[PDB]
Symmetry: C3
């Protein structure tokens, strides 16, 4: 796209503020930003806020979201679809033109770990170029295992294809399949979907801890066979809904856009890989590490 040549828009922080007991404002950009998805491989990603996946959004069950998209793409329209919300797609997930903003309002009345993404046709194009992320809606009543959890992180799986190539996006195998982590609390890592960062800078935990991961597989196209090496999931809540409660799972099948809360105990010091067990994907990047130490 001639108007994206040489474009590399610096990442912009997510803006969020609570405006009432049940109402939140969120402001995101659509922007075009170079991301290093594998060593020496730059992808001029279509993004929210210069991250791909986009920035983590966390709201409470029952919060109405008043969402603004500021479209910094000089020539492509963009839009936002939160899977968390009840909305009219044809009124509320509509396009925002280059250099314009739009504001849309809709309720998040279901707990869980939801994909969000650009909803502009062709949606496959906008997602595959980078316009995906997660919104967590925290359950009013928690999870029944909350008191057991020592530490928590967010991990998101996505694929990367040949650049902006619709034939590849539709018909081709992924070039890379990757994990990223998005921060929940100060100090947590906040990374993009790449083949290396979570190997070189593993997530951290302590021996004996029960870990919760909020996970989503945003695709665009593949399903995920999510597994942590050296443990078993003690508890799993499909889509992060507390009702959908499995136990003792070695691996969690996630559809494209599928989420989960998963919990597991790390009993011994060491480095624990986190994989999709579809090992062709793992080979192509989708292995993160969790380093577990006595401190």
């Amino acid at each position: 796209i001639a108007a994206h040549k040489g474009v590399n828009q610096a990442p912009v922080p997510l803006k969020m503020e609570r405006v009432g007991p049940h109402d939140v404002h969120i402001e995101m950009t659509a922007q075009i930003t170079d991301i290093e998805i594998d060593k020496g491989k730059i992808y001029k990603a279509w993004t929210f806020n210069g991250q791909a996946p986009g920035p983590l959004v966390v709201v409470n069950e029952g919060d109405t979201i008043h969402f603004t998209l500021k479209n910094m793409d000089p020539v492509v329209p963009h839009s936002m679809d939160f899977h968390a919300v009840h909305a009219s797609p044809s009124k509320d997930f509509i396009d925002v033109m280059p250099n314009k903003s739009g504001t849309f309002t809709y309720p998040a009345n279901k707990p869980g770990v939801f994909m969000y993404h650009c909803g502009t046709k062709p949606v496959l194009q906008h997602i595959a170029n980078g316009m995906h992320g997660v919104i967590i809606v925290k359950p009013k009543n928690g999870y029944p295992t909350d008191k057991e959890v020592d530490r928590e992180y967010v991990l998101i799986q996505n694929e990367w294809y040949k650049y902006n190539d619709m034939n590849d996006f539709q018909n081709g195998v992924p070039s890379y399949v990757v994990f990223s982590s998005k921060a929940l609390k100060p100090g947590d890592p906040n990374t993009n979907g790449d083949t290396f960062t979570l190997k070189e800078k593993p997530l951290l935990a302590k021996v004996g801890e029960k870990i919760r991961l909020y996970i989503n597989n945003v695709g665009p196209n593949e399903v995920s066979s999510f597994h942590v090496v050296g443990t078993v999931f003690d508890d799993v809540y499909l889509d992060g809904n507390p009702n959908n409660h499995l136990q003792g799972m070695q691996t969690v099948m996630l559809p494209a856009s599928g989420g989960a809360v998963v919990e597991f105990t790390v009993t011994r010091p060491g480095t624990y890989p986190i994989v999709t067990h579809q090992f062709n994907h793992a080979q192509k990047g989708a292995v993160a590490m969790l380093k577990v130490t006595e401190t």
Copy 2:
């Protein structure tokens, strides 16, 4: 197949009648019928009754089915396998020769949303050419959410490949992935698996309604990441068995031949896409629309 050149057998209505409180007669054809699966693309489908997927069958839990297949294919044998039933495959899902009929009897003692398909070797060939459909077995005791449901429809996902090409069917990506709808009540649409009809003539609903969809992904080969845009599934029953009850799902993972009952509320007027969230498939046809109006 030289004997299928120029063949285009007109669709024949499904014949069904109840013959006792727990016994139903069904009569289907196997026939070769031209179907427009994408604009300007005709597939000379191997079909039940000139529809692909085939006609909807609905029975009650506990019904014994006395099924007749009238094989109108001039040269290929065909057969019928209902996933709903307990049967001996080697006695009851056997071939019916060209220009012959066969009758097979077997019980449907499990509720749910079951694939049916031709069972003739190579089964991949017979399914991929079009010989798939759904049989719904209604639970004796309903679903616990029955009283909440305002409107219901059936949707079926399938793929289309290069015509009658076994190499493609085994090794190739689908050319098209599609939804169709099959009528439950008078006035409901009854369509074939194509890339357009459910976009151009959306399913209809009213603002505020709880919608039930009976869904099945008949494949032949892909899994489905089933999602309705702008809502969340309030309730999901895997395979349509009331016991397999999930809540609050954004997306439902369906294996090949996998079914579900899914229920969701449409809160605002607008057009709501229905997708497989494996967006390469959606791009290749698998997007239906639900138009929600104040009336």
Copy 3:
């Protein structure tokens, strides 16, 4: 690999013995063994004990496993990862060099049907070449349906690719997809992953029996849409954990490495195919047979 030319190491029995009420010794080899995966097609598999998948391991919930790997590969390191166990991957699933042994100890405190596999980088290589299998951990309290089960078997699904070809393993469709059976009791068949043996020598059962299958899809790469023709699963326990209890499933979605216990009734004499309902895979080998007789 020049050091594997002409190598065909005879299969070696699994060695296992109980050493205390809650402790078991297991001794396995890593070895290079020719296996006929389709008629006339030999794969010089990387294996545990000269079987691919490897030998069945069965332990009780709560058993600590003291595992020895004797590496007979003349030049490639190998290792063992049991999904059943809590272990430090970087200490306990480490490599054993050619012509050496290693012993690792770790607890199996979760019931179910777990994949095991070599964990040596690149893991995709070691799994795809043949180094996968199942470990069953029997639940302390059984399954609630135990008293209904008449007969049980183990079935494992895997893929085969072009020989030792990492490009194919990562980017290519499987050449073959196959079932094998591993013995639970004397007289049960014990087979390797091939396209024919379970068609030519079907598993055996009696009319009216409730059958339990312990199943796992070891991949490396595909998901499985597991179905038995002519029946419906009465009960399914995901990953073989008794808590994860579905009913009335026509087909069970297994991720890569995903397991299940599934139970179904065979009501009539006949031959019952067992498939993955992803019919491209079935075409490429993944159909086993269950022959049901009056005796």
